[PDB]
Design a protein around this ligand. Sequence first.
Ligand code: ZOL
Ligand code: ZOL
Ligand code: IPE
Ligand code: IPE
Ligand code: MG
Ligand code: MG
Ligand code: MG
Ligand code: MG
Ligand code: MG
Ligand code: MG
Lengths: 358, 353
Amino acid sequence: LAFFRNMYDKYRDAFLSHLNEYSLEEEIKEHISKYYKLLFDYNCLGGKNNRGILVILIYEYVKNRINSSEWEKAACLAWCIEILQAAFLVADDIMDKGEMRRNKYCWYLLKDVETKNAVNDVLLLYNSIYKLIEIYLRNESCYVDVIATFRDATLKTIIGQHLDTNIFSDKYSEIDVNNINVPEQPVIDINMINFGVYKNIVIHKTAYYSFFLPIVCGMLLAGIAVDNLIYKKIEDISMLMGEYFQIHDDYLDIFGDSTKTGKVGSDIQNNKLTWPLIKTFELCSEPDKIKIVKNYGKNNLACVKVIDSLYEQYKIRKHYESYEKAQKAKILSAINELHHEGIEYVLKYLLEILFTGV
Amino acid sequence: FFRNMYDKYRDAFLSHLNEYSLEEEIKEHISKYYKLLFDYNCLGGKNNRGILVILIYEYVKNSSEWEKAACLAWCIEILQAAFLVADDIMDKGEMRRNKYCWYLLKDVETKNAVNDVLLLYNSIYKLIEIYLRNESCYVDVIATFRDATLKTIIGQHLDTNIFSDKYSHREIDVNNINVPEQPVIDINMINFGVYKNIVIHKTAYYSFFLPIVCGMLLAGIANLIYKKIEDISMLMGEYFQIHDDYLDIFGDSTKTGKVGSDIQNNKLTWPLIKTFELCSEPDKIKIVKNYGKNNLACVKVIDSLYEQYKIRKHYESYEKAQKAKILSAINELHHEGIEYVLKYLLEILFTGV
Ligand SMILES: O=P(O)(O)C(O)(Cn1ccnc1)P(=O)(O)O
Ligand SMILES: O=P(O)(O)C(O)(Cn1ccnc1)P(=O)(O)O
Ligand SMILES: C=C(C)CCOP(=O)(O)OP(=O)(O)O
Ligand SMILES: C=C(C)CCOP(=O)(O)OP(=O)(O)O
Ligand SMILES: [Mg+2]
Ligand SMILES: [Mg+2]
Ligand SMILES: [Mg+2]
Ligand SMILES: [Mg+2]
Ligand SMILES: [Mg+2]
Ligand SMILES: [Mg+2]
């Protein structure tokens, strides 16, 4: 764990090093190294580090101890999930018109960067992962399985980000290849406001890259055979934990303190299908439905305020806290079926520090 | 038969998505969206890169072997697609292959397009796994796509930032979200050394080195010929990009499929550098004053300078001398089969087929 924290530089600088081998003029090489050193630092640091720490812990509690060449490979994988997070979050804030990420301006918003650099930079962060895994793990037998898990995790996430972004779109509620002029007015689709659709999305956008991937990396490296039925159990727990983590997130979009969360709430105005939106539709009077249809998805104070107060009226904070309690018990029940005492402690521990880090 | 086989790889990938734990109506929605993403962006081009895989493979060496080569061939066409979607966002593109750029469609927008670039990119590796996973060259193939992709990313970064304030002692300003940069050229960067740097990275690696290498690995070449091919590919990428820069100024968008944008986007182009080489100090001053401005009278001045200094002429002469340098490099390959394909690629490069 202190190996992880202290070895950020190592992996950052191993990748910067690879590009310094490019056939470029020395001045150009210097400019690239400055730009890219910032892109990693700005975008990979400042968070809780829960995914990376998970890789480290799973790895340790699966093995009976671990040399520093072994740690160097696990912390590699751990940082690569933290680079994956970076890439995803850079793109998310473009998609969601983010203002603040980890208490600092979103990367795409910087005048030195903009959306043109940010898009190129997502691709860079994402490909650095695979270069770093080649550097530290090409000779391991889990090597192909590790790179497969990253790419399949990433594909699931890309699908869920697509659904998060289009579930209410006109495309769905034939795509028009002739319209570049007539913008679509954000409206909610009431046929999509149920927990079934919500789960399809949050499992895909959150659960795979955030829980499944880092646990599987820890296990693949520690050497659990890919045909072991523990991986399926692990997948089922990841889905429970993923939906749990994402609901807490949706909850913070309205109830959090932007100085503590490090980001600014935007789901109402960005027309998202969130747990609060679904719970309220489940509970609210028929005229309040007409009221959510009218006011949701509008970057307008009085419109957002209507929604906030319907969430105040329908006691969404209380319904959340009773979801947290019921879902946590559900996760713990599944963890207790794992028949691996090492992984169980880790996942119990994770579940405690999930919202805070540590 | 290259193009016959397109649906096979697209639908193989769409089948992969269809296995996701998603409600049936949602799977239907995603099949429609993604089929269009692939059809819209993979189809319509010269397919030079895919064809080059196929041909290199044939000339280094049954229908199951062709299933693997066409797979790689279509994966480079998918990478072309990913890079172009991203490039048209970055370059404020208007048309690509005589249709509106994907990012502009009201049903897509930049928010979708950014995600879709990653979808396209990642689709490649799933396809190579489906078709080549038990090939001994599997890991070498995925490493080649990956490294050529890193190279292209760096090159696109340089193309997009070479004249920028951050490069012109001081740091990226992490507190500036409000004061937009006023684009201006950096005269210190207007040289062919810097231009070859950008151009081998953003074009030559994925456009030449990658398709040729794909066919050579699969045909089973383990070998100092790889460095000779690298060197030719760089020669070819430069030649090809200089042609592209040429078309940006002198082309017809109904024939190029795309609307020229380099002057207003502040690109370090071959016509820029060739003009800077040959012009007077007061035209240098005109260039500084007018380049990188999305303004008619400004692009007009630059365009007028390109007429005045006979850039069309200088390009025709460049094309002649550089084709000759590529053929001289090709003749040093001492591989009859690869040599034939490259000579022929060189003949069809600007037109296709
Ligand atoms: O709410 P999102 O899904 O946009 C978010 O959680 C990011 N994200 C992206 C994928 N999964 C989660 P963030 O609120 O941090 O902006
Ligand atoms: O001039 P570009 O680099 O933008 C281009 O050639 C595309 N491209 C992208 C990378 N290398 C070349 P296009 O003129 O097609 O928009
Ligand atoms: C994936 C979700 C739900 C939000 C971002 O995740 P984290 O809260 O784990 O982000 P950092 O700790 O990395 O800032
Ligand atoms: C790498 C360059 C110069 C961009 C255009 O590529 P092509 O001219 O190969 O484009 P398509 O045939 O794929 O349309
Ligand atoms: Mg977001
Ligand atoms: Mg989002
Ligand atoms: Mg959120
Ligand atoms: Mg470009
Ligand atoms: Mg372009
Ligand atoms: Mg061009």
